[PDB]
């Protein structure tokens, strides 16, 4: 579907960013022709919150830069341990 | 309003939890008689993501325990520096 393809592009762009350990949560909607989205990435649990927020900002910039129809994107982080099977992923 | 009072109770419960530096984002809806909500707390930027996630889990437990109609609550964290005016708050 339309949304599924957009979500796939968001996930691909985010996962290229240094420090990203997968996308854990992602929701998006159209508002008219534009996309509004909210996403949560995994990051190294030993990162500081400060470090994680820099990664989030980099993801925001990357995703917004690659996908023109996204009007609004919020990115936040949660822990994701290497070989984590306890959290969802995209 | 109905939702405003519920949101006020969520914020009060969350802000009592050790390590919480304010609620930055909160959205909630009714699904039938039950509430579904998503919230983002501020935490010390020097906390590890691991530490921040323990705070989030404590907030989840606290809020769910105080407000019976909440069926589903997701809690995540962002940085909030002391005397921060750069992020919204409740
Ligand atoms: Zn935010
Ligand atoms: Zn989560």
PDB file of N, CA and C in Angstrom, chain A residues 1 3 8 22-23 33-34 39-40 42-43 49 54 56 58 63-64 66 75 83-84:
ATOM      1  N   UNK A   1       0.847  -1.260   0.000  1.00  0.00           N
ATOM      2  CA  UNK A   1       0.000   0.000   0.000  1.00  0.00           C
ATOM      3  C   UNK A   1       0.865   1.287   0.000  1.00  0.00           C
ATOM      4  N   UNK A   3       0.863   3.970   2.238  1.00  0.00           N
ATOM      5  CA  UNK A   3       1.479   4.215   3.507  1.00  0.00           C
ATOM      6  C   UNK A   3       2.630   3.227   3.747  1.00  0.00           C
ATOM      7  N   UNK A   8       8.328   2.155   4.543  1.00  0.00           N
ATOM      8  CA  UNK A   8       9.530   1.446   4.144  1.00  0.00           C
ATOM      9  C   UNK A   8      10.679   2.429   3.861  1.00  0.00           C
ATOM     10  N   UNK A  22      17.810   0.057  14.511  1.00  0.00           N
ATOM     11  CA  UNK A  22      16.466  -0.322  14.081  1.00  0.00           C
ATOM     12  C   UNK A  22      15.436   0.755  14.405  1.00  0.00           C
ATOM     13  N   UNK A  23      14.295   0.681  13.733  1.00  0.00           N
ATOM     14  CA  UNK A  23      13.142   1.479  14.069  1.00  0.00           C
ATOM     15  C   UNK A  23      12.249   0.569  14.900  1.00  0.00           C
ATOM     16  N   UNK A  33      -2.194  16.233   1.349  1.00  0.00           N
ATOM     17  CA  UNK A  33      -1.182  15.604   0.501  1.00  0.00           C
ATOM     18  C   UNK A  33       0.092  15.340   1.291  1.00  0.00           C
ATOM     19  N   UNK A  34       0.171  15.819   2.535  1.00  0.00           N
ATOM     20  CA  UNK A  34       1.389  15.789   3.305  1.00  0.00           C
ATOM     21  C   UNK A  34       1.322  14.664   4.354  1.00  0.00           C
ATOM     22  N   UNK A  39       8.078   8.617  15.212  1.00  0.00           N
ATOM     23  CA  UNK A  39       8.824   7.378  15.229  1.00  0.00           C
ATOM     24  C   UNK A  39       9.759   7.279  16.433  1.00  0.00           C
ATOM     25  N   UNK A  40      10.064   6.035  16.787  1.00  0.00           N
ATOM     26  CA  UNK A  40      10.973   5.724  17.872  1.00  0.00           C
ATOM     27  C   UNK A  40      12.028   4.763  17.334  1.00  0.00           C
ATOM     28  N   UNK A  42      15.724   2.515  17.985  1.00  0.00           N
ATOM     29  CA  UNK A  42      16.540   1.917  19.012  1.00  0.00           C
ATOM     30  C   UNK A  42      17.932   2.531  18.986  1.00  0.00           C
ATOM     31  N   UNK A  43      18.581   2.586  20.139  1.00  0.00           N
ATOM     32  CA  UNK A  43      19.930   3.065  20.255  1.00  0.00           C
ATOM     33  C   UNK A  43      20.634   2.243  21.337  1.00  0.00           C
ATOM     34  N   UNK A  49      21.366   9.981  27.145  1.00  0.00           N
ATOM     35  CA  UNK A  49      20.191  10.534  26.583  1.00  0.00           C
ATOM     36  C   UNK A  49      20.575  11.678  25.613  1.00  0.00           C
ATOM     37  N   UNK A  54      20.953  13.438  19.874  1.00  0.00           N
ATOM     38  CA  UNK A  54      21.700  13.818  18.652  1.00  0.00           C
ATOM     39  C   UNK A  54      21.448  12.838  17.514  1.00  0.00           C
ATOM     40  N   UNK A  56      18.654  11.086  17.200  1.00  0.00           N
ATOM     41  CA  UNK A  56      17.268  11.362  16.786  1.00  0.00           C
ATOM     42  C   UNK A  56      17.214  12.545  15.816  1.00  0.00           C
ATOM     43  N   UNK A  58      19.581  13.598  13.875  1.00  0.00           N
ATOM     44  CA  UNK A  58      20.184  13.189  12.617  1.00  0.00           C
ATOM     45  C   UNK A  58      19.196  12.376  11.779  1.00  0.00           C
ATOM     46  N   UNK A  63      15.569  11.744   7.208  1.00  0.00           N
ATOM     47  CA  UNK A  63      14.295  11.278   6.708  1.00  0.00           C
ATOM     48  C   UNK A  63      13.574  12.427   5.987  1.00  0.00           C
ATOM     49  N   UNK A  64      13.514  13.593   6.645  1.00  0.00           N
ATOM     50  CA  UNK A  64      12.892  14.776   6.072  1.00  0.00           C
ATOM     51  C   UNK A  64      13.552  15.124   4.738  1.00  0.00           C
ATOM     52  N   UNK A  66      15.033  13.135   2.609  1.00  0.00           N
ATOM     53  CA  UNK A  66      14.856  12.101   1.578  1.00  0.00           C
ATOM     54  C   UNK A  66      13.410  12.041   1.096  1.00  0.00           C
ATOM     55  N   UNK A  75      11.066  12.355  16.156  1.00  0.00           N
ATOM     56  CA  UNK A  75      11.903  11.164  16.411  1.00  0.00           C
ATOM     57  C   UNK A  75      12.339  11.164  17.869  1.00  0.00           C
ATOM     58  N   UNK A  83      21.243  -7.984  19.380  1.00  0.00           N
ATOM     59  CA  UNK A  83      20.513  -9.264  19.411  1.00  0.00           C
ATOM     60  C   UNK A  83      19.289  -9.220  20.317  1.00  0.00           C
ATOM     61  N   UNK A  84      18.668  -8.040  20.401  1.00  0.00           N
ATOM     62  CA  UNK A  84      17.438  -7.831  21.136  1.00  0.00           C
ATOM     63  C   UNK A  84      16.264  -8.432  20.354  1.00  0.00           C
TER      64      UNK A  84
END
